[PDB]
Symmetry: D2
C-alpha cells in the first residue's frame, strides 16, 4: 500500500549499516533464557532488565556531563542535561507497567533458573546511587568477584557527589557554604547539615536574585522524587510477584527495599520546606 | 545509611550472577559511537534505538504467542498476551520524550557519521509490520544483503497475518467469513472486504452473545491505535530534529512517514464504525 | 488557515450546545481563589484538586457498576469496567506531575487562606477507600458538618466492599469461602484471613480451569497497586511542598500519610505470593 | 486500621472545609446526563470533557502569564510557566486513554441526546488556539449565541499571539526581526516568513551566546508538538468511536480534524531545521 519511493538506498552491502552502527548482531544475541523447556515469560524478564541497564548506562553518561557543567558554572547547560536525565528516569519508572503483566504463577515457572542472581548485583545501578550521594562502602565487598567493577565503584565513591558539586557551585557564588565542602573524605556519605538551612531559605525566598540556584534546587528535587518513584514501583512489583518471600539475592526482600525508600539524597532541600516563607 | 542485611550472597565468583544471566559484558559493549572527537549526544542516539530494538524483539515474541493462542481458540490467553503487547507498544511510544531533548544543532554535530543507515532498514520492525498485515513485497529488496533476514521476512510474508488469524478464528465459530480466508495467497496484503461489515455489526450489536469476539475486536483496535501513536510520535520527532530534510535512508523523510500513517492494519474494524448501532 | 466547511452548524442560539450540555457556566465559575491580592499559583491549586474530584466521581460510578456485575456473575462485563477504572486511577496518579511545578515559596504565598481545609475531608476519596475495603468508622465524624454527605458515607460503610463481593462471587462457584462472608457486619474493615490461602493457591496453580477467577484476582492486584501509587505520589508531593510540617487538617502530615501506605485492600491476594507454586 | 491522630480537626461545622473551598457542591452537580433511561457511559463522556475544560482553563491562565513575562523580558519566569503549561497539555493528551474504553456500540446508546453540540463549540479550546497563533475570524460566528463569550474570543483574536510576542522579544534584543511585527493587523493568522530564517539560524548555531532564545525556541517547539499530539489522539479516538461518520457539529469529522493537524503555530521554527548547521 505504500510504494517504495525512488531514491531509497538498497545496496548497503558495503557501507555503514543500521545493524552495523547499532551492533545489533551482538545486542540481539545477548538474550539467553535458561529454562528447559523454554518458558514464554523469561524473554520479557530478560528484556525488562536489559532495557533498564541501557537506560542506566545513558543516565550515568548524562549525570557525569551535568557534573562537569556544574564544575564550570555552566548552569543552563547543566539544567538541559538534567532535563534529559529526568526523562530517562521517567522511562525507567514507566516501564514497570510491562513487567506487571507477569503473574506469580508465571514467575514460579523459571525463578529457580536465576540462582542467586539479583539487581542488587547491578554495578550500573550502584554507580548511579553513589554518584547521587548514597555512598555505602559496605557495597564494595558485594563486588569482590569483579575487582574491575569494584574499582570503578571505588572511583565514584572517592569523588564528590552530584549534590556535593552543587554545594561547591553555591560556594563559588557567595552563598554561606561551610568550608568542609571544599575538601573532605568524600567516601563518607553526606550527613544532613543544619547550617545549610539559612542558605536555601535565602534562595527560595529571593527567587528573583537567585533564579539560577532556585532552578537547580528544584531540578535536584525533581531528580530525587523520580528516583524514589522508581524504587517504589520496583518495590510494588516485587510485592505482587514474590510477595514477602526472601530475595534471590539473599535479602529479606520488600523490607530491605523499603529501607532504601526511607533514604534521601538531598536532605537539606527537603528539610528547608519546614521553614521557607513566601517569595519576594 | 542502609546497613547490609545478613544472608546476602557475596561469594559469587563461581556462580550465576545478574551480569552473567543478562550477558551485560556483551550488552554494554554494544554501544560504539563513531564521532571523532566524541559527541555527547551520540550515546543517547544509540541507546534510544537499541532500547527500541529490544522492545521490538519482545513484541515479536509476544505477537507470535498471541497468534498460536488464536489458532487454538485460546481466547483468554490470547487476550493476556495482547495486553502485554499493548504495554510494550506503549513503552516504545512513551520513550520519544527522551529523544525530544535532542535539538537540530546538536544532531547536526554527528548526523553525518550515520551515512545511509536508517531504521527503515530495521529487520525486526519490518517483521512486525508484516505480521500485523502491512505486507509490502517491495521491502524484501532492502534486505537482499541479508539472506537469512530476507528468508525470515519471507516466512511471515507467506503466513496469515494476526488479523487474518482473527478472521479464521471467527470462521471456526460460525460467523459469515468468506471461504478465501481458509487458504489464499497470503503474501498479498489484505484488501478491505465489505462482506465483513455485517459480520462485525452483529458482534458489536450483540455483545452479550459475542463477548469473546467483541473483546478481541477492541484489542485489535487498541493495538492499531497504539502503533499509529508510535508512528505519529516518531514522525513529530523527525519534524523537530531534521524538519523536511530528506532522510539518511534516501526517502523524502516526513512525507514518506506520513504515507504509513495513512495506512490501516484492520480496515473493517474501523469501517464498521459508520454503520454500527446500539448494543442490546 | 482552515476554512469552515459548509454544513457546520453556526447558528446555535436556541439549540443544545457544548457549553450547555456540559454545564460549563456552572463548572467554570467554581474556581474562587481566596488570596488577596490574587496569587497566580492558586488557580493551579484549585484546578488540580477539582480535576481529581471529577475523576473520583467517575471512579465511584464505575466501581459501583463493577460490583453489580460481580453480584450477577457477569465476569467479562466486570473486567471491562475495572479496565476503565484502572485508566481513571492512572490519570489521578499521572496528574501529580502538574502540581510538582509548585514550589514551597510559591505555596507559602497562599497556604494560610486554606484554614483547616484538607483533602482528609474529601468525601469522594473516603467513599472510594470504603468501597475498596479500607473501612474506618472514625471518619464518619469528620463529616458531621454535612449530614447528607455523612449519610452516603455511612451507606457504603454498611455494604460489602468490592473485595467482599469478589469473595461472595467465588463462593457461588464452589470455592471454599468461609460462611461468614455470606453476611456479617460490613462496617468492620476486613481482616487478613488465613483460611483463604488454599482458595487462592488453587486458583493460581490451575489457571486453565480457573481463568475467570485468576483474571479477577490480577485485576484487583492492579487496582490496589495503582491506588498505592496514587498515595505514594501524593505523599512525595507533600514532601516537596511542605516537607514535614503538620497538615492544615491537623495531622502530622507525611508520617500520617505513610501509615495508609501500610494498609492493604486485598491482603490474601498478596499473602498467597509466598506459597503459590508453578501453574499447570 | 489507621487510627485518627489527636489534633486532626474533626469538628468543622462552622469552618472552611475542603468541599467548601473547592466549591464541590457546585462542581459535582454540574454532571447532568440527558439519556432516559440513564446510560452508564454518559458519565464518562461528560467527565472526560469537563476535566479537559478545567485543564484548558488552567492552560489559558498560565499562557497569559507566560506572555506577560515575555513582554517584560522575564525569560526564566516565562520558561517556568511554559514548563507548567507543557505538563497541563500532557495531562490533556494522556487522558484520551480513558475515553478509548468507550466502544461504538456503547456510544450509539446516547449519541443522539447530544443534538448538534460539539467540541467545535469549545470556547476555551478556541481561545488557546487563537492565543498560540491559529487565528480564524470565521470562528466568531459560532459563538454568536454567546455575546460575552464571542467578545472575549475577539479580544484574543486582536492581540499579538504568544509567537508574535516572542518575535517582539527577539526584536528588543537586537535580532533582525522585520518591522511589521511591531504593529500590524493581528486578526490575520501569521504567515510563514522567509526573512526570519537567518534569525533562527544564528540562534541555533550560536547557542552559547543565544542560550535564552535557544531555550525559548525549544520550549515553543515542545508546546506545538504536544498540542499536535492532543489533536492526533483526539482524532484517533474519533476514528475508533464514530469512524468516518459526519460529526454532530455538522463537519465531515475525521477529515476536517486532519486539516488542523497540517496547521502550524510556529512555522519558522520548524522551517529552520532544513538549513541549520552544527552548533559552535
Ligand atoms: C519479578 C521482578 C522482580 C523481583 C521479584 C525483584 C525482587 C528484588 C529483590 C527481592 C531485591 C532485593 C535484593 C535481593 O534479595 O535479591 C531486589 C533488588 C533490586 N532490583 Fe529487583 N526485582 C524484580 C525486578 C527488577 C528489575 C526488572 C530490575 C531492573 C530494571 C531490578 C533491579 C533491582 C535493583 C537495582 C535492586 C537493588 C535495590 C537496592 O539495593 O536498593 N529488579 N529486587
Ligand atoms: C533523530 C531521530 C530520528 C530521525 C531524524 C529519524 C528519521 C527518519 C526518516 C527520515 C525515516 C524515513 C527513512 C529514511 O529516509 O531514512 C525514518 C524511518 C524509520 N525510523 Fe526513524 N528517525 C529518528 C529516530 C528513530 C528511532 C529512535 C527509531 C527506533 C528504532 C527509528 C525507527 C525508524 C523506523 C522503524 C523507520 C521506518 C518507518 C517506515 O518504514 O514507515 N527512528 N526515520
Ligand atoms: C501542595 C499540595 C498538597 C499538600 C501540601 C497536601 C498535604 C496533605 C496533608 C498534610 C495531608 C494529611 C491531612 C492533613 O493533616 O491535612 C493530606 C491528606 C490528603 N490529601 Fe493532600 N496535599 C496536597 C495536595 C492534594 C491534592 C491535589 C489532592 C487531590 C485529591 C489531595 C488529597 C488528599 C487526600 C484524599 C488526603 C487524605 C489521605 C488519607 O486520609 O490517607 N491532596 N494532604
Ligand atoms: C466519543 C468521543 C468524541 C467524538 C466521537 C468526537 C468527535 C468530534 C468531531 C466529529 C469533531 C468535528 C466537529 C464536528 O463535526 O462535530 C470534533 C471536534 C472537536 N472535539 Fe471532539 N470528539 C470526541 C471527544 C472529545 C472530547 C472528550 C473533547 C474534550 C475537549 C473534544 C474536543 C473537541 C474539540 C476542541 C474539537 C474542535 C477541533 C478543531 O476545531 O480542530 N472531543 N470532535
Ligand atoms: N522543576 C520543574 C518546574 C520548573 C521549571 N523551571 C523552573 C525554574 C525554577 C523553579 C522551578 C522550575 C521543571 O523543571 O520543569
Ligand atoms: N531478585 C529477584 C530476581 C530478579 C529480578 N530481576 C532480575 C534480573 C536479573 C536476574 C535476576 C533478577 C527475585 O528475588 O526473584
Ligand atoms: N479495549 C480496552 C477496554 C476493554 C477491556 N475489556 C473489554 C472487553 C470488551 C470490549 C472492550 C474492553 C482494554 O482492553 O482495556
Ligand atoms: N534516518 C535518520 C537517521 C537515524 C535515526 N535513527 C537511527 C538509528 C540508527 C542509524 C541511523 C538512524 C535521519 O534521517 O537522520
Ligand atoms: N492484569 C493485567 C494482565 C492480564 C491481562 N489479562 C489477564 C488474565 C489473567 C491474568 C492477568 C491478565 C491486565 O489486566 O492487563
Ligand atoms: N492539607 C494541605 C492543604 C491542601 C492540599 N490540597 C488542598 C485542597 C483543598 C484545600 C486544602 C488543601 C496542607 O497541609 O497544606
Ligand atoms: N526542550 C527540552 C530540552 C531542554 C531543556 N533545557 C533546554 C535549554 C535549551 C534547549 C533545550 C532544552 C525541555 O524543556 O526539557
Ligand atoms: N462531536 C461529537 C460529539 C461530542 C464529543 N464530545 C462532546 C462533548 C460534549 C458534547 C458533544 C460531544 C460527535 O460527532 O459524536
Amino acid at each position: 500500500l505504500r510504494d517504495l519511493e525512488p531514491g531509497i538506498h538498497t545496496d548497503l552491502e558495503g557501507r555503514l549499516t543500521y545493524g552495523g552502527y547499532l551492533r545489533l548482531d551482538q545486542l540481539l544475541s545477548a538474550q539467553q533464557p535458561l529454562s528447559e523447556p523454554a518458558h514464554h515469560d523469561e524473554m520479557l524478564f530478560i528484556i525488562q532488565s536489559q532495557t533498564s541497564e541501557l537506560w542506566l548506562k545513558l543516565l550515568a553518561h548524562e549525570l557525569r556531563a551535568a557534573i562537569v557543567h556544574l564544575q564550570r558554572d555552566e548552569v543552563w547547560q547543566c539544567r538541559k542535561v538534567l532535563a534529559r536525565s529526568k526523562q530517562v528516569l521517567r522511562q525507567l519508572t514507566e516501564q514497570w507497567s510491562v513487567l506487571e503483566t507477569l503473574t506469580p504463577s508465571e514467575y514460579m515457572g523459571f525463578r529457580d533458573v536465576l540462582g542467586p542472581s539479583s539487581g542488587f548485583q547491578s554495578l550500573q545501578y550502584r554507580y548511579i546511587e553513589f554518584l547521587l550521594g548514597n555512598k555505602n562502602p559496605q557495597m564494595l565487598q558485594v563486588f569482590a568477584y569483579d575487582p574491575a567493577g569494584q574499582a570503578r565503584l571505588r572511583e565514584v565513591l572517592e569523588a564528590p557527589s552530584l549534590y556535593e558539586e552543587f554545594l561547591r557551585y553555591l560556594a563559588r557564588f557567595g552563598h554561606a557554604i561551610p568550608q568542609q565542602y571544599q575538601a573532605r573524605d568524600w567516601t563518607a556519605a553526606h550527613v544532613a547539615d543544619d547550617t545549610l538551612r539559612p542558605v536555601f531559605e535565602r534562595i527560595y525566598e529571593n527567587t528573583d536574585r537567585y533564579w539560577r540556584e532556585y532552578s537547580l534546587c528544584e531540578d535536584l528535587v525533581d531528580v530525587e522524587t523520580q528516583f524514589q518513584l522508581w524504587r517504589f514501583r520496583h518495590m510494588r512489583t516485587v510485592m505482587r510477584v514474590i510477595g514477602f518471600k526472601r530475595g534471590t539475592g539473599g535479602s529479606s526482600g520488600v523490607g530491605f527495599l523499603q529501607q532504601a525508600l526511607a533514604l534521601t539524597f538531598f536532605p537539606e532541600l527537603f528539610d528547608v520546606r519546614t521553614s521557607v516563607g513566601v517569595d519576594n
